[PDB]
Paper text:
[name] virus ([name]) is a highly contagious virus responsible for causing serious livestock disease. The virus forms an icosahedral capsid from 60 copies each of the viral proteins, VP0, VP1 and VP3, organised in the form of twelve pentamers. VP1–3 are surface exposed, each adopting an 8-stranded β-barrel conformation with extended N and C-termini, with VP1 surrounding the 5-fold axes of symmetry, and VP2 and VP3 alternating around the icosahedral 3-fold axes. In the acidic environment of the endocytic compartments the virus particle dissociates into pentamers, releasing the RNA into the cell to produce viral progeny.
Here we have determined the low-resolution structure of isolated pentamers formed by the acid treatment of infectious, native [name] particles and in addition have captured an icosahedral assembly of these pentamers, which have associated with the reverse curvature to their normal organisation in the mature native particle. Analysis of the unusual assemblies revealed them to be slightly expanded compared to native [name] capsids (312 Å in diameter compared to 297 Å). Convincing initial rigid-body fitting, assuming that the shell represented an expanded particle with collapsed 5-folds, was possible only when the whole pentamer of the native virus was turned upside down and VP4 removed. It was then immediately apparent that the structure of the pentamer seen in the mature virus was broadly maintained, with VP4 not detected and portions of the N-termini of VP1 and VP2 disordered. The final model comprises residues 27–208 of VP1, 29–210 of VP2 and 1–221 of VP3. The interactions at the pentamer interfaces in the inside-out particle derived by analysis of the EM density at the protein interface of VP2-VP3, showed that the pentamer-pentamer interactions are weak and have fewer hydrogen bonds and salt bridges than observed in the native capsid. The BC loop of VP3 (residues 68–73) and the adjacent EF loop (residues 135–136) interact with a strand of VP2 composed of residues 62–68 and the CD loop (residues VP2 85–88) respectively, of the opposing pentamer to stabilise the assembly. Thus correct re-assembly of pentamers is hindered by the absence of both VP4 and the N-terminus of VP1 and the accompanying minor structural changes that have occurred in VP2 and in particular the rotation of VP3, which would introduce steric clashes with the opposing VP2 in the native particle structure.
Residue numbers in the entry:
A (entry chain 3): 1 to 221
B (entry chain 1): 27 to 133, 155 to 208
C (entry chain 2): 29 to 210
The structure:
């Protein structure tokens, strides 16, 4: 009374992604319940919200030179996922192990001069390919721009919408084309009030929308 | 959001260099840039079940922690015999302590507790390890690849012909 | 003020338990404050100037007596940091409760703020306030052979001074073991 055998013609590979399980040997041992032990996280995302970052410049010093002079342009830095501006960075550090992604990078700002001093500053987006960096905050305003002064506040956060070609993009970059991927988005300012010295800080963080698809080892393990 | 739940990322294998007729079973013999150890290091306190896969010859034998190593070959404590070509098992957990960790600052050699164990046979060629249901606690710093040249980065990309 | 900032939770604690707790009950009179020197901080120090302080030191207190009593215990930790200056300066220093300290390295400097933490600047803050709940690989601990907790502060923003400030500035803190069960 044999049951009809159905011998497997050519399947059953010892391949990685399989979810099959196994059998214990010296098994059947309990353990204490590990509820209530603080420090629990489940997603690099949420913990990739509550923390800012610290950018970098050729001065090797995070903070930015901030001169109380008649200059009109502050400084220009790129923003990307693989760029010298954002290497030592928690978002990217998680990222470099990914090829697919969709999410807005976020920012922060911290001030140095005494509260008394008056000031103005103007954030300014730029698309990847305008072929010309704007040379005045009004004609720079065309892309995206905003304001927040010394008045009533010191912290501030701002973002840049996840523009692309299609609803995804490559994390790493190429050696087959030339055009920058995002632009040179940086900030403008109006007449400085007074300072013997100042300083600006900026960061990054994931907010609502940071997304990834995965995985592959890039490294030379 | 349908990733960063480690329960999906930490269910694969990774290589181990060292081998011996008697060999040790612990995570800290990982590689410190293989993606497994990327997150696997990134926290403070973690915990899982265990699964392993071994290609070998002879008679693979294992024992939980806290034993006399001089008391293994004899008396054939739990074990099964030999069979080619593949072999897959899963070990349960033998805590002397209610959670694992990475490093323990005391007056920098690794402690003697955290020990998934040790295997022994007559010919041991290939090892494979696999985490289970793990959880992570008190995350820690992390780095990316270092930057040397000027602009952003450059990297070759595969394309058809 | 900016207020209080807890570590990973804020809640009344368990206080009474089994044979070990019934033997290591919540004694109260082993609790008291004291201050400790942190560092000098003038316009000289460039960025990255790290400094550390292991915990806990000795103390001529009953707490100090039992932490020498050379046996199993447990504890909590409330810290409150501050310093004195004047409104004619600028910059920011970074403060952080430290789980599982290790000797750091250059590149990772830009990372210091996974931990619970606060900022330091003359305008915004004048008094830190943080607390960390217990933990440990065992149910309890015995110090002399380990230290699970230290406390760190390091340079974050360069300091500035004009002709109307004290060209030397000092910084103090507040050590406070709490919720103790011996």
């Amino acid at each position: 009374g044999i049951f009809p055998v159905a011998c497997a013609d050519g399947y059953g590979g010892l391949v990685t992604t399989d979810p099959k399980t196994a059998d214990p040997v010296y098994g059947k041992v309990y353990n204490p319940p590990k509820t209530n032990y603080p420090g629990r996280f489940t997603n690099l995302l949420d913990v990739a919200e509550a923390c800012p970052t610290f950018l970098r410049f050729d001065d090797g010093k995070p903070y930015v030179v901030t001169r109380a002079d008649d200059t009109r342009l502050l400084a220009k830095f790129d923003v990307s996922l693989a760029a010298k501006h954002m290497s030592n960075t928690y978002l990217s550090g998680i990222a470099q192990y990914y090829t697919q992604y969709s999410g807005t990078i976020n920012l922060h700002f911290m001030f140095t001069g005494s509260t008394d001093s008056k000031a103005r500053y103007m954030v300014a987006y730029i698309p990847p390919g305008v072929e010309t960096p704007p040379d005045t905050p009004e004609e720079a305003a065309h892309c995206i721009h905003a304001e927040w002064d010394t008045g009533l506040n010191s912290k501030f956060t701002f973002s840049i919408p996840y523009v692309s070609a299609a609803d995804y993009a490559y994390t790493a970059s190429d050696t087959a084309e030339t055009t920058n991927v995002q632009g040179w988005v940086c900030v403008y300012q109006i007449t400085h009030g007074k300072a013997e010295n100042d300083t600006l800080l900026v960061s990054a963080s994931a907010g609502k929308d940071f997304e990834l698809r995965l995985p592959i080892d890039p490294r030379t393990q | 959001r349908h990733h960063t739940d480690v329960g999906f990322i930490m269910d694969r294998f990774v290589k181990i260099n060292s081998l011996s007729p008697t060999h040790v079973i612990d995570l800290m013999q990982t590689h410190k840039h293989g993606i497994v150890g990327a997150l696997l290091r990134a926290a403070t306190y973690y915990f899982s079940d265990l699964e392993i896969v071994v290609r070998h010859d002879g008679n693979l034998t294992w024992v939980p922690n806290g034993a006399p190593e001089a008391a293994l070959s004899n008396t054939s404590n739990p074990t099964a015999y030999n069979k080619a070509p593949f072999t897959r098992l899963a070990l349960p957990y033998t805590a002397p302590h209610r959670v694992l960790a990475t490093v323990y600052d005391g007056t920098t050699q690794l402690p003697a507790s955290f020990n998934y164990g040790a295997i022994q046979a007559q010919a041991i060629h290939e090892l494979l390890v696999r985490m289970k249901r793990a959880e992570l606690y008190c995350p820690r710093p992390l780095l990316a690849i270092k930057v040397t040249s000027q602009d952003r980065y450059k990297q070759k990309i595969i394309a058809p012909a | 003020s900016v207020g209080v900032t807890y570590g990973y939770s804020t809640e009344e604690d368990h206080v009474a338990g089994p044979n070990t707790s019934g033997l290591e009950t919540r004694v109260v009179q082993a609790e008291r404050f004291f201050k400790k020197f942190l560092f000098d901080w003038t316009t000289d120090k460039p960025f990255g100037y790290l400094t550390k302080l292991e915990l806990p030191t000795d103390h001529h207190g009953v707490f100090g007596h039992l932490v020498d009593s050379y046996a199993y215990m447990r504890n909590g930790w409330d810290v409150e940091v501050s310093a004195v200056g004047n409104q004619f300066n600028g910059g920011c220093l970074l403060v952080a409760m430290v789980p599982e300290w290790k000797a750091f390295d250059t590149r990772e400097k830009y990372q210091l703020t996974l931990f619970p933490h606060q900022f330091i600047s003359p305008r915004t803050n004048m008094t830190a306030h943080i607390t960390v709940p217990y933990l440990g690989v065992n149910r309890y601990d015995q110090y002399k052979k380990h230290k699970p907790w230290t406390l760190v502060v390091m340079v974050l923003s360069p300091l500035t001074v004009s002709n109307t400030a004290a060209p030397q500035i000092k910084v103090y803190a507040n050590i406070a073991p709490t919720y103790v069960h011996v």
